[PDB]
Amino acid sequence: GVFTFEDESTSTIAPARLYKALVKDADAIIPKAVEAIQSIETVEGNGGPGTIKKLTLIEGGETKYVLHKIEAVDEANLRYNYSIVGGVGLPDTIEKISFETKLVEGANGGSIGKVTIKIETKGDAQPNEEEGKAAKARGDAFFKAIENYLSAHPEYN
Numbered sequence: 641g642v643f644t645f646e647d648e649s650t651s652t653i654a655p656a657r658l659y660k661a662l663v664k665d666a667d668a669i670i671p672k673a674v675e676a677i678q679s680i681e682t683v684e685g686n687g688g689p690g691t692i693k694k695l696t697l698i699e700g701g702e703t704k705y706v707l708h709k710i711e712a713v714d715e716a717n718l719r720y721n722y723s724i725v726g727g728v729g730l731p732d733t734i735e736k737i738s739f740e741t742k743l744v745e746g747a748n749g750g751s752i753g754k755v756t757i758k759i760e761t762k763g764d765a766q767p768n769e770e771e772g773k774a775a776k777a778r779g780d781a782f783f784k785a786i787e788n789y790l791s792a793h794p795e796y797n
């Protein structure tokens with residue numbers, strides 16, 4: 641099945657600037673933004689749609705990886721879609737989790753990040769709370785964790 645829900649966040653950072661870092665500078669930021677994430681390596685492609693990347697991370701005593709795919713990039717509308725693909729770093733009941741993000745200008749000039757998350761399951765029961773939280777968390781590296789690191793960084797203050 642497919643479990644779809646919406647998430648919204650804010651940033652003090654102007655949307656074009658935030659968007660640019662999300663789509664151009666992820667590889668450099670993410671291992672600095674997330675203590676557990678050791679490295680990101682691009683496996684196939686150049687940063688546009690179809691690109692596959694491997695995140696190497698430590699969770700408990702175990703070195704694991706997830707694969708990330710860039711689904712869509714539309715700079716004119718500040719749209720960035722991506723997914724984490726079925727396996728080592730997702731719960732067993734989950735084939736894929738996609739994040740569909742759009743950045744929009746807040747009234748006061750910061751950003752509102754509008755996200756639709758789609759969790760694809762093997763079965764006919766929506767994921768239990770933890771397995772969905774764990775899957776969502778894998779996707780945070782690519783959006784929320786970057787906005788967080790940037791908001792505390794000298795260049796975006």
Ligand code: NA
Nearest residue numbers: 671674675677
């Ligand atoms: Na790290």
